[PDB]
Amino acid sequence: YLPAVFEEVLDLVDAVILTEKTALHLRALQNFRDLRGVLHRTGEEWLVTVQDTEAHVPDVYEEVLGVVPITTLGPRHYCVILDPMGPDGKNQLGQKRVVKGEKSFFLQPGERLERGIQDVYVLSEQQGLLLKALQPLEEGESEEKVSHQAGDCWLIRGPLEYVPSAKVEVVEERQAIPLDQNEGIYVQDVKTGKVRAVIGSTYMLTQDEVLWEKELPSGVEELLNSAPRNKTR
Amino acid sequence: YLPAVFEEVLDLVDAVILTEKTALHLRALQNFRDLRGVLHRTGEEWLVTVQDTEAHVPDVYEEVLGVVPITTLGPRHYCVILDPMGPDGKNQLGQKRVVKGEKSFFLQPGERLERGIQDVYVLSEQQGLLLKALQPLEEGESEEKVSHQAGDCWLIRGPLEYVPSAKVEVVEERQAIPLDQNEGIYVQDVKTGKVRAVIGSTY
């Protein structure tokens, strides 16, 4: 290029290379129209990927805020995107969206993972999830179709996999206890206080059951015949 | 721009960039009309957001008091705005308005959060909220539809979520006590003094 009499030549700007693993996040310094023909306002931040241009030149109207690597959630993974941009094109502040299911997306401008890609919960026959519905209306959230209120703790169990929705929250892990005949555990149903002393097959506490201590009037050494007794079972 | 013979050129003023996360709070130094065509009095403070201009130049008639970040109340949050500006366009002094429900607003000039974004109350079957209605007429305040008087304490319980209205005030947490048969707690009903010794289920 031969500069004109007036063109003061500045530094040569190279194009950033976009693979499907990266996207370019940049803010429009001022109102203009990009190469692809999209309006942009003075301060709007957005992403350019391989679906638009394989090698994007930072325009004079754009400031490259950075390069975002692709966030890939494996077949067994989920993430909680904070402030997800809705259909209108703006970050929904305060809100959060759970995303899972072997996906690979880009963190939109303003979005941020809650705790990153953590793990998807997998529980067997002897594992549970004690959950709290700190936000009400868990009606169509899963197959159970039972609508939990705002705070009523409940236990989900079975050989299955779970992703905690935005409303629900994991309270505890609830490992079961293996019991045979003539053996059991003292369970107090804190929702009613009643102690049941459930014996027989293996058992795990429900949403509102706690191991209950059984005190003996010093008549324990005479029945054991060093190691303290498990005074809860 | 080529200055005239009389124009004494002052400093170049740059436009502040407004994202949906920020707004510009500024006071009119004197009566004028803004770019959008809104009258402003000598001393009136107001906000400009992205809904008006994406990059606002501080006018010669305006003094930028600052930039306010957006106050976002999550799906489980509330705030108590002190001195909320009513429909007339003035701060209602002394008053306070509770705002909740996954919102994202801007603190209007003169408004201020009571204690900021604290938390929305969530209580299970074994948690309560002992509340005092220090301001009367809690008639249509919630679904219970029962009108509490000016100061009569009452307990709200259940697997639900609560936001304390401006009139009501949280007194205490009221955790339940798990009781089985042949066990209970001695309760004195201070409204009548009688002691009941309630036994049986949890209470």
mmCIF file of N, CA and C in Angstrom, chain B residues 54 86 107 111 169:
data_model
loop_
_atom_site.group_PDB
_atom_site.id
_atom_site.type_symbol
_atom_site.label_atom_id
_atom_site.label_comp_id
_atom_site.label_asym_id
_atom_site.label_seq_id
_atom_site.Cartn_x
_atom_site.Cartn_y
_atom_site.Cartn_z
ATOM 1 N N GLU B 54 -25.916 5.784 24.612
ATOM 2 C CA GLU B 54 -24.855 4.824 24.897
ATOM 3 C C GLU B 54 -23.559 5.491 25.340
ATOM 4 N N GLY B 86 -41.197 8.630 44.149
ATOM 5 C CA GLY B 86 -42.502 8.202 43.717
ATOM 6 C C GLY B 86 -42.792 8.617 42.291
ATOM 7 N N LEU B 107 -30.116 2.967 41.447
ATOM 8 C CA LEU B 107 -30.448 3.776 42.615
ATOM 9 C C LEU B 107 -30.700 5.203 42.150
ATOM 10 N N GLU B 111 -32.094 8.129 46.563
ATOM 11 C CA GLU B 111 -32.388 6.813 47.102
ATOM 12 C C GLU B 111 -31.125 6.183 47.685
ATOM 13 N N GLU B 169 -41.236 -6.368 61.120
ATOM 14 C CA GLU B 169 -39.828 -6.437 61.492
ATOM 15 C C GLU B 169 -39.525 -7.812 62.066
#
